Symmetry: C2
Subunit: 107 residues, 2 copies
């Protein structure tokens, strides 16, 4: 059920893009965003815990990523290298997690 | 740094194998074992919350696997088709997750 959408999909280099998160599961611990099509802690952008309400930057964090409590990912000042796919992992309390993947284009 | 290693790597058809998990990072949530070299909710074997102590079987559960508090995974009555890769995801509490992938063969 979990899906993500870009807003706007096509983004002008310089201003922001919003990756909305739809159909969030229930029973949640936190979120994890990754740069790419797969879940990879080596390319993790940010890790946010709901209970502690504090986010931790991953290896691929550029400082331009503000995360929202609904796991939505905002990227201000989009670079041509910020283009491509973005993967979200929603960590459920029963450790049976869910992942969605989205993308946006940059000119 | 989180690594795993099959023990033994070369397994006799029908016998047992253990995927030792060490270099475990402190401050954890729980574990998730997947069948394959990628983290993927459908090929999930087991999910374990270390504070609920609860262990929920995934869609890839064959009832031969057993996860331990030390995150290790043991597979009994090993068939030859199991020859492949297994991915453990260690969920931190800062939600910056670590992953290790194990390998074992059956002769």
């Amino acid at each position: 059920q979990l899906t993500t959408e870009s807003m706007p999909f096509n983004v002008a280099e310089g201003k922001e893009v919003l990756l909305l998160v739809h159909n969030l599961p229930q029973q949640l611990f936190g979120y994890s965003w990754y740069k790419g099509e797969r879940v990879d802690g080596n390319r993790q952008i940010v890790g946010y815990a709901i209970g502690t309400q504090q986010a931790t930057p991953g290896p691929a964090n550029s400082g331009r990523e503000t995360i929202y409590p609904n796991a939505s990912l905002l990227i201000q000042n989009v670079t041509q290298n910020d283009t491509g796919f973005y993967t979200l992992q929603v960590i459920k309390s029963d450790l049976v997690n869910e992942e969605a993947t989205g993308q946006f284009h940059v000119y």
